[PDB]
Amino acid sequence: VSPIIATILLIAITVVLAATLVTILGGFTHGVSNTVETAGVTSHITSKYIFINVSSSSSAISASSITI
């Protein structure tokens, strides 16, 4: 009797460890993305205005997505 019952208990424990491991991995598998951008920019500053002129960029992006 007892060696089979001990085996059933060890299977039950194994499933909870595997379920625990899955929640540990979730802390690694997020928030990685390609955020690199590169632009040819020139600028001139005066007592009233900053002028900004763009010559090229790595990608086309919305002017609302850029913070100054």
Ligand X SMILES: *[C@@H]1O[C@H](CO)[C@H](O)[C@H](O[C@@H]2O[C@H](CO)[C@@H](O[C@@H]3O[C@H](CS(=O)(=O)O)[C@H](O)[C@H](O[C@H]4O[C@H](CO[C@H]5O[C@H](CO)[C@@H](O)[C@H](O)[C@@H]5O)[C@@H](O)[C@H](O[C@H]5O[C@H](CO)[C@@H](O)[C@H](O)[C@@H]5O)[C@@H]4O)[C@H]3O[C@@H]3O[C@H]([C@H](O)CO)[C@H](O)[C@H](O)[C@H]3O)[C@H](O)[C@H]2O)[C@H]1O
Half-sphere exposure (Cβ direction) of 24: Cα atoms closer than 13 Å:
6
Indicate whether 30 belongs to the interface with a second copy (CB under 8 A).
yes
Tell which positions 44-63 bind a second copy, by CB under 8 A.
Answer: none
Q: Which stretch binds a second copy (CB under 8 A): 1-9, 44-52, 60-68?
A: 1-9
The option from ligand X, a second copy, none interacting with 50 (CB < 5 to 8 A, set by class) reads none
Work out whether 30 is an interface residue with ligand X (CB under 6 A).
no
Residues 6+ apart with CB under 8 A from 57: 37, 38, 39, 40
